[PDB]
Amino acid sequence: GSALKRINKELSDLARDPPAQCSAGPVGDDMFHWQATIMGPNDSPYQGGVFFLTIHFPTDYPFKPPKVAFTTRIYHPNINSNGSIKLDILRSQWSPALTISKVLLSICSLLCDPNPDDPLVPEIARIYKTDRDKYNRISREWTQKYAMRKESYSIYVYKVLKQVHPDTGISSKAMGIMNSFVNDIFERIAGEASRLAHYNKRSTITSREIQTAVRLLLPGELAKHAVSEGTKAVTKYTSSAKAKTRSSRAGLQFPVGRVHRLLRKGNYSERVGAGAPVYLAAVLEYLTAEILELAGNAARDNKKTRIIPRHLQLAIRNDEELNKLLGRVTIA
């Protein structure tokens, strides 16, 4: 679609020469929903703070303006508690010629030079005009008080397979599918968790939002066992000593740090608790163990010692719950 491609080009343009004091990227695999971070302009009382914004592209982009709003509380004549930004380009003076990079730069200038004559919060716009010292001081108070290549898991898939079926291998084509399953589950769970975080106005994704997403997106026994594996992992991670590896502290084969990084890298939320990646990592490992156990069992009926894409198709189709989860994923 034109909207998508236009969005993808701006990202490419933004990626090469990012805007000063700014950065933006999609949320998960959703190109129509971005997260943006602005470093406190040096020529402003907001210096030192990191402000988080949300961006939503309409279907008719670039012929319609993007919906931009602050998720971090800020004190400004043109920004209200809803994060709404009164800026001419955002609504009145939209043009397809503008870019998200230009928008963000126009917002930065707005923080350096407010427009108190066309205000969104009158009290702030009055304090700004009559007592600039009071405005600058409160701004810093708020700044201080509020603004402070598909992934591959071949090793861990291999490690789980060695636990479940020590004498069964997996072809390269079968391993690629595994990576597709793990990445899809990651995207869908994280995506939902992000939704829940924004929905309830939470700046940190914790194991709480990871569990609710699992309980909602996984069917029947898969969800019940998944929730059990995620809980057992988070319990072991808290009690276990700090000296050993995050994955080891949770008794998992999958990498917590990598998941934790991806949780941040994906812009699913402003922050990500330390429990969240453990929970998701445990959930990812369990499903991998389930899929690999069935596939290997499938490779055995045909007297094969190496899982191939066919045995993966079979293991999913033979299990009602898994097929409900992995039906859409392609299997060549």
> What's the first-to-final CA gap in the chain, in angstroms?
26
- Which positions ≥6 away from 101 have C-beta within 8 Å? 10, 13, 14, 18, 19, 22
Rounded Cα distance between 101 and 9, Å, is 12
Residue 300 carries which side chain, given as an amino acid letter?
R
Q: 49, 240, 253: which is closest to 139 by C-alpha?
A: 49
Contact (CB, 8 A) for 315 and 295: yes
DSSP H helical segments within 50-171, as ranges?
100-112, 122-130, 132-146, 154-164
Q: Where in the chain is the domain with CATH 3.10.110.10?
A: 2-146
Rounded Cα distance between 252 and 286, Å, is 9
Note the Cα 195 to chain centre separation in Å: 9
155 token code pair: 């090793």
Q: What are phi and psi of 73, to 5 degrees?
A: -55, 135
> What method did the depositors use to determine the structure?
X-ray
Rounded Cα distance between 165 and 226, Å, is 21
* Resolution of this deposited model, Å: 3.9
The Cβ-side half-sphere exposure at 173, using a 13 Å CA radius, reads 11
List Cα–Cα distances, 93 to 15, 58, 118, 208, in angstroms: 25, 16, 15, 42
- CATH number of 2-146: 3.10.110.10, 3.90.180.10, 3.40.50.11030, 3.30.43.10? 3.10.110.10
Outline where DSSP puts E strands in the chain: 22-27, 30-39, 50-56, 67-70, 169-170, 204-205, 271-272, 306-307
DSSP H helical segments within 131-219, as ranges?
132-146, 154-164, 172-199, 207-217
List Cα–Cα distances, 89 to 105, 175, 220, 228, 259, in angstroms: 12, 48, 49, 50, 38
Residues in the chain: 332
Angle between helices 220-239 and 207-217 (to 10 degrees): 160
75 torsion bin: left (phi>0), alpha (psi -120 to 50), beta (else): beta
Greatest Cα pair distance, the chain, in angstroms, is 84
Q: What are phi and psi of 84, to 5 degrees?
A: -70, 135
Q: Where in the chain is the domain with CATH 1.10.20.10?
A: 154-326
Rounded Cα distance between 173 and 312, Å, is 10
CATH class of 154-326: mainly alpha
Rounded Cα distance between 148 and 209, Å, is 23
Rounded Cα distance between 311 and 299, Å, is 6
Pairing assessment for the beta strands 22-27 and 30-39 based on DSSP bridges:
antiparallel
7 token code pair: 């969005």
